[PDB]
Amino acid sequence: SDTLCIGYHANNSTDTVDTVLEKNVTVTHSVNLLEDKHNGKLCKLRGVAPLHLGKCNIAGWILGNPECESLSTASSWSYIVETSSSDNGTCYPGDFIDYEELREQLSSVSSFERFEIFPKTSSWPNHDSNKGVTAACPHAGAKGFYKNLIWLVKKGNSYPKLSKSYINDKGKEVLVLWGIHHPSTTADQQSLYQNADTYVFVGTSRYSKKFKPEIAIRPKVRDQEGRMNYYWTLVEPGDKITFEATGNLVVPRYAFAMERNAGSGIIISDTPVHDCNTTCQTPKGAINTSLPFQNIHPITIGKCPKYVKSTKLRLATGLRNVP
Amino acid sequence: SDTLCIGYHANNSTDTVDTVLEKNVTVTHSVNLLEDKHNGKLCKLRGVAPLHLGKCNIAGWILGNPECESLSTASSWSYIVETSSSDNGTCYPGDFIDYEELREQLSSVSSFERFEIFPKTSSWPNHDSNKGVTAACPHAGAKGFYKNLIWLVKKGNSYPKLSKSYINDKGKEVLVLWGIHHPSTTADQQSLYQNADTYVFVGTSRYSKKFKPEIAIRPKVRDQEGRMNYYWTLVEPGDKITFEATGNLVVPRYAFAMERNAGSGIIISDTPVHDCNTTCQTPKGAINTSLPFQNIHPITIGKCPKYVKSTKLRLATGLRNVP
Amino acid sequence: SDTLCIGYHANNSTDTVDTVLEKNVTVTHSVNLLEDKHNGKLCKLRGVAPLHLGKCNIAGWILGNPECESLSTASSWSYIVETSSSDNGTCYPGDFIDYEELREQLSSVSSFERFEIFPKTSSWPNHDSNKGVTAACPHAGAKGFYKNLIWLVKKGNSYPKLSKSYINDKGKEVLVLWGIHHPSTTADQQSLYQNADTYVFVGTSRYSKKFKPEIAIRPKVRDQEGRMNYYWTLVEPGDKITFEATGNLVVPRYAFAMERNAGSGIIISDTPVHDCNTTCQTPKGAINTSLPFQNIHPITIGKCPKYVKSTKLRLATGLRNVP
Amino acid sequence: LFGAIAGFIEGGWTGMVDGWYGYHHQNEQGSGYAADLKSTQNAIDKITNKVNSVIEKMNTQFTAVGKEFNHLEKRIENLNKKVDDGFLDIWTYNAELLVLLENERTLDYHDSNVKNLYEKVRNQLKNNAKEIGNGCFEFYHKCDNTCMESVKNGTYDYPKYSEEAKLNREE
Amino acid sequence: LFGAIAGFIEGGWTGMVDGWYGYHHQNEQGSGYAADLKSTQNAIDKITNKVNSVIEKMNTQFTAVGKEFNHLEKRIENLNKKVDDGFLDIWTYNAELLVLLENERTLDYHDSNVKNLYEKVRNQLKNNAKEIGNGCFEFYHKCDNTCMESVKNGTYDYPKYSEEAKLNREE
Amino acid sequence: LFGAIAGFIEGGWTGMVDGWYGYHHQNEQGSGYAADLKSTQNAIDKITNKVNSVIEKMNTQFTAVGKEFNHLEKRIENLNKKVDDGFLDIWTYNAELLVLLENERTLDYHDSNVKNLYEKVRNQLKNNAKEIGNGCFEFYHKCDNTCMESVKNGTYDYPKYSEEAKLNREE
Ligand SMILES: *[C@@H]1O[C@H](CO)[C@@H](O[C@@H]2O[C@H](CO)[C@@H](O)[C@H](O)[C@H]2NC(C)=O)[C@H](O)[C@H]1NC(C)=O
Ligand SMILES: *[C@@H]1O[C@H](CO)[C@@H](O[C@@H]2O[C@H](CO)[C@@H](O)[C@H](O)[C@H]2NC(C)=O)[C@H](O)[C@H]1NC(C)=O
Ligand SMILES: *[C@@H]1O[C@H](CO)[C@@H](O[C@@H]2O[C@H](CO)[C@@H](O)[C@H](O)[C@H]2NC(C)=O)[C@H](O)[C@H]1NC(C)=O
Ligand SMILES: *[C@@H]1O[C@H](CO)[C@@H](O)[C@H](O)[C@H]1NC(C)=O
Ligand SMILES: *[C@@H]1O[C@H](CO)[C@@H](O)[C@H](O)[C@H]1NC(C)=O
Ligand SMILES: *[C@H]1O[C@H](CO)[C@@H](O)[C@H](O)[C@H]1NC(C)=O
Ligand SMILES: *[C@H]1O[C@H](CO)[C@@H](O)[C@H](O)[C@H]1NC(C)=O
């Protein structure tokens, strides 16, 4: 006699999922909710490439440490990348003031142009712009210095009051860095700048700081018992910046006219940089997902899945596989 | 023959809701869980009105910039409000030290009394309390200055050591502000204070700072090549504050005895202030609700619904509407 | 005729739980998900005891305030404990620089050895290491001072330039603290150090700071119109620290070679310390549980349940109790 | 899902206005809709409780979200932003999904209530009536208004009519 | 909800102490309660798993929540507070609602287990017994203890008794 | 749970490949498996919607998680770490439990669909066939392929065969 039975699917599948009531339940079909694969590459975030410093850090890079000139500086970037051997920084020892804030502010720019605010040949007719070099910042075997700064020293036996202004006619803000030098001894002070007891003064519409050299022996670093502190400010469009000095000023040469973007970050890894787009970047590599969770890395840049500690988040679509 | 059917309700309704399994499902009755309406007004938070600065910012207000005296200062407030044209602040250019921490500390007070800590007529018999005015802080067309500070300048050809104490007998903490003046040139320094090379010293039981004028030309701001930095401290009840100076001190005149409340905030908007109560305030306007979510604004003050990105959170109460 | 009925359990129980649809539902069996009991004791976290300062705070403790020598200093600890009567700190008034960061860095150490970096008997042959005591830091009724610092004053009528280095040969970082003294008056300055107008300079490979005394009358604290600021740095292994001074330096005597652990914290309570293990510590007492939530205290140290505002979180295991 | 609403009872009654679930009779004396007030009320109480549970469990504290940072505090500004933004992402997701989940359940709850009510009736009548389906029962006897009202309030006397029904059932 | 517990089986048995769901028989040889150990155990395992899922999925790391800020760090003090307070609100809400939801589900789970067990029995017996209701079945034949134990462990022989039942059924 | 899958229909059909739920017939003309495409599709749409709900409701904003602090900024470093770690604990727990809950529900959803489909058929046939159980129906008449296809698409004519069935039923 004739029959008609009611029933359900079963198959090949060995996909398991977990439920509140039961673990390791085998199901016909299932879909994964956790991204755990990355491409092993540092890619272009929202279509724009990162700045790759390689041999240097940001300090070395914006100051123009001699080892960083083989880099080429783009005119925009989405995030910055240093490597674990990015050890070329401030070759002359000292304090880089508000450095961490500086790195955050440069982390993304939409426009970046280096330019000679105070041209070497023309700006310093009463001081010596050619000496002012050190074994701490060696170039081609010979004593050198930062590219974007000049260490002004006395001419003959004379350091007359120095006075120099720059008006920002660039229509974007311009980042200006300078440095101040603290000699080891009064003999060194006088060797370089003639007058002991000097001052440096720097000012904009919103900034004003006076600096006095602090002459003493520090512990030797890269053979220096002296020290050099590096400072920086951002001159707004239309504003000007003015320098005044009776010695000890490491004056700017290059500056940078920039347009900041918006909180990006700096990634430190040896993962290689590639041509690829992504919307989510980790130091291990990039993530290409629409899935809401990931377990690759907690420190991401972009529109990222939420980092979780899970190893498996598998969602049943089909039904219990019973044969 | 007789029948009895079992069934369910249906109606007018076009309310839809979403479920995990199905979107746009029409239901008989439904309730909304997301507040999306605000009253377009800045109201009184927990019954007490905000401080509305209008033409000035907090800096201008507490210093007594001449454009802010047409304001009237209440003796308590729940939060502060500035507008986007609150541009009257420190009319004499300089640095307002720990300004942001100051604004956070004044954001809500339960008690606030302005009072003449160092009365003008009586406190400065050996210095000139009447000159000491500037084109940077103009009053009725003529040169003026802050109301809550006096710019003490020399009397005849003499600035004798100044020395003044105040003991806090007010039973609440009192906020004392002062300023220090950095002239353009040694000529100016000597015009105002006679002695070049001066110092100002300020101290309480827990505070102690020495200040030396830094004399140099800054870029002109409101026609000033000089500068003036503003400082502040809170003298705790019973403690005292002492000033000592051979020049360059902008002394207090008014101070404020206050009781801080507890983290409120400052809202910056041109939304008008009104007489209305609320328990939750946004810069766009206030929210009257007991619903757990809102999508009006993320920066709120009060007991607020949680800000979400949803456009619709409608919860089914009734059943599937089928006709 | 014969019958067979199907049914379910009921019992003694009065356990209730709540559901979305219904409150106060009586169930047969139930399990609690919220830890609300603590043992009223401050215990040893992951087997290792906290540092209990009792009478003193961290400032008093690492400086060697005379009231803290009855403490015994362990060579490792999991977290620090102060009481609400931990009022013995810097007996000579002043500013303890970066104090909060210091407390955070000492909150847990795996190794801690106090040692005489600059031995009293041998290190200061041209200065007076015996005078240099004060009524602000009294010992056995008589005037005293910190144990871990020496207040060097002139010998006879002479304070020659002082110059002293220490090289860190300890294979861990060593924490060195020192102080600088600001006299009340030039008479006091000259009484102690002979020369008015002095400087102190301190330096390592990464640290460099010059200090000048600021001579003036402050409001009396513990009978002192002068002041004394306390500074500290961590000398890394192999590096050295150097002191240079023409007066006003309170020189180190003891220093501490330490190994920092990893973010622990300091708890402030009068809850007594006991021999007890725990994996989760609150200021009210310790928590022994594997339940995911707790309502005892929000500020915990260890692997803790999540603090919630709930009074009851009871999960039904059995079924509706119907009799 | 319980197979009743939008299922084996394929439509709703716009004509039944006094409640959520109920009956429609037809005898010699007339016909009409009438809600089951006990089971309707029971559901209202429970749904109400659900709504209030979702609303009233939210802990609200006084807080000023906004902070202001100077131009050399970008890092803590961005820390702050991360916090605000992290909370936004969490609440948005939970709120969205909570609602989606609870709505599926609410709808199913009603399906269940309607099914249980069909079964309640079926097990009173048994063979004294025929299961047409579409939720209707077609009596094998004269069910006057007193009889109807007895089924509706659960006190239907099977014995009374069992013989009148049996003889009618066979033809 | 499945309509069994607090429903068509209107009460529980205080007298059944060896498990959650079961039977009560009555024949010529005696009478008594006896849990279904297979289905009771099955449920315990699954509920246990639920309890452990809720507990053991919580990721806990070593952390010192407390921070200390000086009097010029009010802003980051308040930031810190906003963080602590934000987490409190989130956990409280989720925990409260998690429990409310899971309890509705646990109770329904039991309802289902009891219903499935009734149905298991009904579909073995069929017309060899009468559905009194309140969860009882009234046999049309002599069901000895071996017979009972056969229905309870699902191996009941319909054929064996089908004729003895048929003749008895007609009164 | 609805008692069908892994229950009163004790196994699945590897042989039914064109869908999730369906039938297996056997008459004089042949035999074979065939999915119910309407109810299978219906479920696919709804499950798909569930998957997309869980994925697409996640709000993601642009953020750079990493921050760098100098050696005197331990405290805000640790504040930052507390934030990162707090978010990790929340997301991990919710994600883990979301999935556990939704999987229990998805599986139950299918159980329900299979049960509803059995009931759909049972209430068409009634006494024109016998409920063997294990989800089978054993006809009391000759059900040709047109007849089968009529029960499968819900247009089965009870009257047509009701008499052919009654006479066959009595043996
Ligand atoms: C750039 O970095 C290199 C390596 O990071 C520096 O050279 C090192 O100098 C140390 C100590 O002075 C030597 O002991 C190492 O052998 C050197 N390493 C290498 C790879 O050469 C170099 O001084 C840096 N140059 C500048 C200009 O900063
Ligand atoms: C109050 O602010 C107003 C405008 O915000 C000042 O007036 C401006 O002054 C600037 C610079 O000195 C001039 O370039 C303009 O002529 C003025 N602008 C406008 C819109 O009026 C005014 O000087 C302020 N006064 C004080 C005491 O702070
Ligand atoms: C140690 O702390 C105690 C109090 O905790 C200090 O004693 C107080 O001294 C003041 C004056 O300095 C007296 O007016 C009080 O009578 C004392 N208070 C108590 C409770 O006795 C003590 O001076 C501190 N000593 C050191 C060396 O730090
Ligand atoms: C990345 O994006 C840009 C602009 O949005 C586009 O022109 C380009 O093709 C993309 N690059 C790659 C490698 O896909
Ligand atoms: C706001 O509430 C307080 C309650 O004390 C009341 O005095 C006041 O009148 C209220 N104001 C308005 C405008 O409703
Ligand atoms: C629906 O119709 C009713 C009665 O005709 C009326 O009271 C109500 O205003 C109408 N509202 C809608 C939902 O259109
Ligand atoms: C605490 O436990 C540790 C190891 O678990 C053990 O060594 C110690 O004796 C215990 N101390 C207590 C609980 O008193």
Side-chain angles (χ1 to χ4, degrees), chain B residues 121-161:
Chain B
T121 61
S122 74
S123 297
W124 314 114
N126 306 322
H127 304 79
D128 192 343
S129 79
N130 282 325
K131 289 171 186 167
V133 138
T134 170
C137 302
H139 208 330
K143 300 211 294 262
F145 201 57
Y146 301 101
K147 185 130 187 225
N148 303 330
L149 305 178
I150 259 65
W151 190 349
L152 286 187
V153 82
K154 71 182 179 195
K155 196 189 209 175
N157 274 275
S158 159
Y159 196 113
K161 168 163 279 145

Side-chain angles (χ1 to χ4, degrees), chain B residues 2 5-6 8-9 103 310 316, chain D residues 9 13 16 68 96 136 143:
Chain B
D2 298 352
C5 299
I6 312 308
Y8 49 91
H9 188 61
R103 329 206 331 150
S310 311
Chain D
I9 313 181
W13 296 333
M16 180 170 78
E68 42 195 35
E96 290 276 10
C136 294
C143 189

Side-chain angles (χ1 to χ4, degrees), chain A residues 55 65-67 85 87-91 136-138 222:
Chain A
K55 213 191 161 148
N65 176 310
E67 297 292 318
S85 58
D87 298 337
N88 291 116
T90 53
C91 42
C137 303
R222 305 172 57 79

Side-chain angles (χ1 to χ4, degrees), chain B residues 1-12 16-23 25-29 31-33 45-46 58 78-79 82 99-104 107-108 261-268 279 281 290-294 298-323, chain D residues 4-7 9-28 47 50-51 54-55 58-71 73 84 87-88 91-92 94-104 106-107 110 114 117-118 121 125 132 134-144 148 151-152:
Chain B
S1 79
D2 298 352
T3 66
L4 183 41
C5 299
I6 312 308
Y8 49 91
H9 188 61
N11 61 24
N12 235 357
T16 66
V17 305
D18 291 25
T19 80
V20 275
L21 299 184
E22 202 181 343
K23 295 152 89 88
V25 172
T26 311
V27 305
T28 53
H29 314 75
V31 78
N32 179 46
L33 232 55
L45 193 58
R46 275 280 301 277
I58 290 165
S78 43
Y79 63 101
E82 301 183 330
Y99 182 46
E100 288 80 19
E101 286 280 320
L102 185 60
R103 329 206 331 150
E104 191 74 322
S107 58
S108 181
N261 232 76
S264 188
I266 299 95
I267 281 165
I268 303 183
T279 47
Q281 189 64 62
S290 32
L291 303 180
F293 307 113
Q294 60 93 10
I299 91 121
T300 64
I301 301 171
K303 283 169 189 182
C304 285
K306 291 293 189 280
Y307 178 71
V308 290
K309 205 74 166 169
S310 311
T311 82
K312 152 164 172 139
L313 294 170
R314 190 155 270 283
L315 200 69
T317 56
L319 55 146
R320 211 182 258 282
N321 200 354
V322 182
Chain D
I5 291 168
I9 313 181
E10 55 180 29
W13 296 333
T14 67
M16 180 170 78
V17 301
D18 57 325
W20 271 339
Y21 330 117
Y23 316 92
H24 169 92
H25 62 96
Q26 169 146 75
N27 54 6
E28 206 213 305
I47 299 289
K50 182 191 284 209
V51 177
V54 166
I55 289 171
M58 176 64 80
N59 191 67
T60 338
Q61 314 192 293
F62 184 96
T63 148
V65 174
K67 293 279 167 289
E68 42 195 35
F69 299 101
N70 86 325
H71 78 289
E73 290 177 317
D84 282 348
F87 286 156
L88 163 60
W91 280 117
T92 291
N94 296 356
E96 290 276 10
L97 282 172
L98 176 69
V99 168
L100 290 190
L101 253 93
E102 274 317 280
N103 286 347
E104 232 342 292
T106 297
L107 268 29
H110 289 295
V114 167
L117 189 60
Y118 185 73
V121 172
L125 311 180
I132 293 176
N134 205 15
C136 294
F137 289 106
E138 179 169 280
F139 289 90
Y140 291 136
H141 63 87
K142 267 276 166 285
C143 189
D144 83 356
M148 293 290 182
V151 175
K152 296 187 196 196

Side-chain angles (χ1 to χ4, degrees), chain F residues 11-23:
Chain F
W13 296 333
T14 68
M16 180 170 78
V17 301
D18 56 325
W20 272 338
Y21 330 117
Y23 315 92

